[PDB]
């Protein structure tokens, strides 16, 4: 067993050191948002394969005083020079500068911090600047990712520079330092988010993306905005409300899965015998299949009209119509679930 | 992708999911800044690229300048009728995010598994296309049998299915769990 219960506050990150950094921010009087940002800056180091200031994020935020939830959309956008037919192979869309969308991460941290921050901006970076310089043992997750991508890393000197030892990827437990990122984090701490989007880092960002074959420009960075969503998606389950992001994220899919399944009134009894458990898991998979059939009509709601799609996906009555089509005895062919590529 | 969950002493909460997309993103690192750039453009559909046998590219998710690509991310906060947070949850793992988040919720809310069990319990995934159910290596094999006798074809995940970080309110306070699949642990006070 490996349980962790806290009387006052908690941070669950995917690396212990980053959870601790978030926790320390809370103990120092930070808001949940301050702690989240401090932890995220650390995850961008310890799990650098996963996320960081070159990417984008969404935050779902709940204020217990106002009893209101909000969402911050800071996902990457396609650059101004992008177009529908820009890629002709998977390799083109996956590797190199042309695969890069405009990073949203730091503008997301900034907007969240402006709205909900208590600690100084620079304080959020300090522990990560130290960590990046001192280094840390490569953890389980990063080690497995390094091994998985060993060929590409080892043949790219700029990645080898940080992720290898003796020309081979780092193994679990070996020390990783991130000295250039430490310096970038320090600049961000001192100069703010503007350093990234319209400041001292911007020209170099553009140079790096373009040198690798990309099309991101300074104007793209200058024009990037994180977006506050005051009315996130919600669904009612029993006496609770679940807040989650709508399109372009998958809240509508999650909502539909749960609304399909809620009509089965699952409980501990649902898993108490193999007969019950087997039927329960079959029903779960069928709910997944129905929900994913509807997902193909989703896209960025600024560009695609998803209004009716999302209304259905979040409708309890629609979900009941789908649950009625789940056969207890069998799954069905793909067409049964009515995936649609057009409305 | 990474998911983090936070509850502060005043009861406010954040569920945050962040990503550079594939492992190491675009594989473009700046030699000057150290920044590792995303390959989020890969999350768009492209008319010229078939990703999966028999699956058409999705026109709703084509690239346009200024557009954001569709995501499987779903950072969630569950709040009780009394205004107190009940659960903060989300996941990493591409298209398995949404199903894994659902499972963590089902496991805690309905099956009554504590938060660590809700995170550690074996998962399964089906996204319709492709037409297979993926199960984790340690799933109850009575579940595999129940699926196969109902005509699902199953395959075992080569590694694992998703990564979930969660916090649940209990009588004892805030119970937290990070997923052993990736190696995290929570912290608190
Ligand atoms: C894909 O082909 C289209 C049409 O010729 C072209 O506009 C685009 O530049 C191509 N993309 C790449 C990366 O070769
Ligand atoms: C929560 O809402 C209260 C009441 O409006 C406000 O005073 C406080 O700043 C909010 N907390 C955060 C972290 O934004
Ligand atoms: C900052 O933005 C202005 C326009 O908003 C532009 O003239 C200037 O070149 C930008 N500087 C950088 C470093 O992007
Ligand atoms: C759920 O969704 C909509 C927001 O558009 C609104 O009618 C309702 O107030 C929301 N419920 C809660 C509890 O926030
Ligand atoms: C919404 O659901 C109804 C069935 O309840 C269906 O008739 C309608 O076509 C659906 N709308 C969309 C946009 O798919
Ligand atoms: C998908 O799997 C189901 C379940 O065995 C089967 O009935 C169907 O023929 C498969 N193929 C398609 C195209 O749905
Ligand atoms: B993450 O590495 O698991 C990728 C998430 C991405 N496919 C998205 O935004 O859904
Ligand atoms: Cl670095
Ligand atoms: Cl994660
Ligand atoms: Na735990």
Nearest CB to B65 within list A78, A243, A342: A78
CB neighbour list of residue B33: distance below 8 Å, 6 or more residues apart: A180, A181, A183, A184, A201, A204, A205, A208
Resolution at which this structure was determined, Å: 1.4
* Same domain as A271, residue A149: no
Q: How far apart are CA B105 and CA B15, in angstroms?
A: 14
Asked which of A202, A231, A260 is the last residue of a domain, the reply is A231
In B, minimum Cα distance to A2 occurs at B116
Among left, alpha and beta (phi > 0; psi -120 to 50; other), residue A280 is: alpha
User: Which ranges constitute the DSSP H helices of chain A?
Assistant: 16-27, 32-46, 90-94, 105-116, 121-134, 140-148, 150-154, 157-163, 179-191, 194-198, 202-211, 218-223, 251-262, 274-295, 307-313, 316-323
Cβ count within 10 A of residue A276: 15
Report CA(A199)–ligand 9 centroid distance (Å).
31
Do B71 and A249 contact (CB within 8 A), yes or no?
A: yes
In terms of Cβ atoms closer than 10 Å to its own Cβ (0-12, 13-18, 19+), residue B165 is buried
Do B140 and B124 contact (CB within 8 A), yes or no?
A: no
The dihedral over CA atoms of A246, B22, A213, A167, expressed in degrees to the nearest 10, equals 160
Range of the domain at A50: 1-231
CB neighbour list of residue B86: distance below 8 Å, 6 or more residues apart: A240, B78, B79, B80, B168, B169
The secondary structure of B130-174, three-state, reads CCCEEECCCCCHHHHHHHHHCCCCEEECCCCCCEEEEEEEECCEE
> How many residues are there in chain B?
189
DSSP state of A300: -
* Same domain as A224, residue A248: no
Do A57 and A108 contact (CB within 8 A), yes or no?
A: yes
Cβ of residue B157 closer than 8 Å to a chain A Cβ:
no
* Same domain as A259, residue A225: no
Q: How many domains does chain A have?
A: 2
Among left, alpha and beta (phi > 0; psi -120 to 50; other), residue A235 is: beta
Report CA(A232)–ligand 2 centroid distance (Å).
18
Cβ of residue A149 closer than 8 Å to a chain B Cβ:
yes
Longest dimension (CA), chain B: 57
Bridge partners, A69 (sequence order): A62
CB neighbour list of residue A314: distance below 8 Å, 6 or more residues apart: A233, A235, A252, A255, A256, A259
Could you identify the atom of ligand 1 that is nearest to the CA of residue A92? 13
* Same domain as A74, residue A211: yes
Helix (H, G, I), strand (E, B) or coil at B73: coil
* Same domain as A189, residue A44: yes
* Same domain as A210, residue A291: no
Asked which of A231, A256, A276 is the last residue of a domain, the reply is A231
Do A140 and A197 contact (CB within 8 A), yes or no?
A: no
Do A234 and B57 contact (CB within 8 A), yes or no?
A: no
* Segments making up each domain of chain B, as ranges: 1-189
* Same domain as A215, residue A95: yes
User: Does residue A307 have its Cβ closer than 6 Å to ligand 5?
Assistant: no
B1 is catalytic: yes
* Same domain as A139, residue A22: yes
Among left, alpha and beta (phi > 0; psi -120 to 50; other), residue A81 is: alpha
* Same domain as A264, residue A198: no
Buried b (16+ CB within 10 A) or exposed e, A308-318: ebbebbbeeeb
Q: How far apart are CA A125 and CA A114, in angstroms?
A: 15
Q: How far apart are CA A155 and CA A336, in angstroms?
A: 46
The method recorded for this entry reads X-ray
Asked which of A190, A212, A231 is the last residue of a domain, the reply is A231
């Amino acid at each position: 067993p490996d349980n962790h219960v806290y009387t006052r506050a908690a941070v669950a990150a995917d690396a212990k050191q980053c959870s601790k950094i978030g926790r320390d921010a809370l103990r120092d009087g930070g808001s949940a948002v301050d702690a989240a940002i401090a932890a995220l800056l650390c995850v961008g180091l310890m799990n650098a394969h996963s996320m960081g200031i070159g990417g984008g994020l969404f935050l779902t935020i709940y204020n217990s005083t106002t009893r209101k939830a909000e969402v911050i959309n800071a996902r990457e956008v396609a650059p101004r020079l992008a177009f529908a037919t820009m890629f002709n192979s998977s390799e083109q869309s996956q590797k190199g500068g042309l695969s890069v969308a405009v990073p949203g991460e730091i503008r997301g941290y900034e907007l969240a911090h402006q709205r909900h921050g208590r600690l100084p901006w620079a304080r959020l970076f300090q522990p990560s600047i130290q960590l990046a310089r001192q280094g840390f043992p490569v953890g389980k997750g990063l080690a497995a990712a390094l091994e998985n991508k060993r060929t590409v890393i080892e043949q790219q000197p700029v990645l080898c520079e940080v992720f290898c030892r003796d020309r081979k990827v780092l193994r679990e437990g070996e020390r990783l330092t991130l000295p250039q990122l430490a310096d970038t984090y320090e600049t961000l701490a001192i100069e703010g988010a503007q350093a990234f989007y319209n400041g001292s880092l911007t020209a170099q960002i553009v140079k790096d993306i373009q040198a690798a074959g990309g099309i991101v420009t300074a104007e793209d960075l200058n024009n990037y905005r994180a977006e506050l969503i005051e009315h996130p998606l919600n669904i009612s389950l029993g006496d609770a409300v679940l807040y989650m992001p709508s399109a372009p994220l998958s809240g509508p899919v999650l909502a539909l899965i749960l609304n399909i399944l809620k009509g089965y009134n699952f409980s501990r009894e649902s898993v108490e015998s193999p007969e019950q458990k087997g039927l329960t898991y079959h029903r779960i998979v069928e709910a997944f299949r129905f929900a994913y059939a509807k997902r193909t009509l989703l896209g960025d709601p600024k560009f695609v009209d998803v209004t009716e799609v999302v209304r259905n996906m979040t409708s309890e009555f629609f979900a009941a119509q789908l649950r009625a089509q789940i056969s207890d005895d069998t799954t069905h062919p793909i067409s049964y679930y009515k995936p649609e590529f057009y409305t | 992708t990474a998911h983090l969950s936070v509850v502060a002493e005043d009861g406010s909460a954040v569920s945050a999911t962040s990503t550079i997309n594939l492992y190491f993103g675009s594989k473009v690192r700046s030699p000057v800044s150290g920044i590792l750039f995303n390959n989020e453009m890969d999350d768009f559909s492209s008319p010229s690229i078939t990703n999966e046998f028999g699956v058409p590219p999705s026109p709703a998710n084509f690239i346009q300048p200024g557009k954001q690509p569709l995501s499987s991310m779903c950072p969630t906060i569950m709040v009780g009728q009394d205004g107190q947070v009940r659960m903060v949850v989300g996941a990493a793992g591409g298209t398995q995010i949404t199903t894994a988040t659902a499972l963590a919720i089902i496991y805690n809310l309905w099956f009554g598994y504590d938060v660590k069990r809700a995170v550690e319990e074996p998962r399964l995934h089906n996204q319709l296309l492709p037409n297979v159910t993926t199960v984790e290596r340690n799933i109850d094999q009575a579940v595999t049998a129940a699926l196969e006798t109902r005509h699902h074809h199953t395959q075992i995940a080569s590694t694992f299915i998703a990564v979930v970080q969660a916090i649940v309110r209990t009588a004892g306070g805030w119970a937290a769990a990070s997923d052993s699949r990736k190696g995290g642990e929570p912290a608190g006070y």
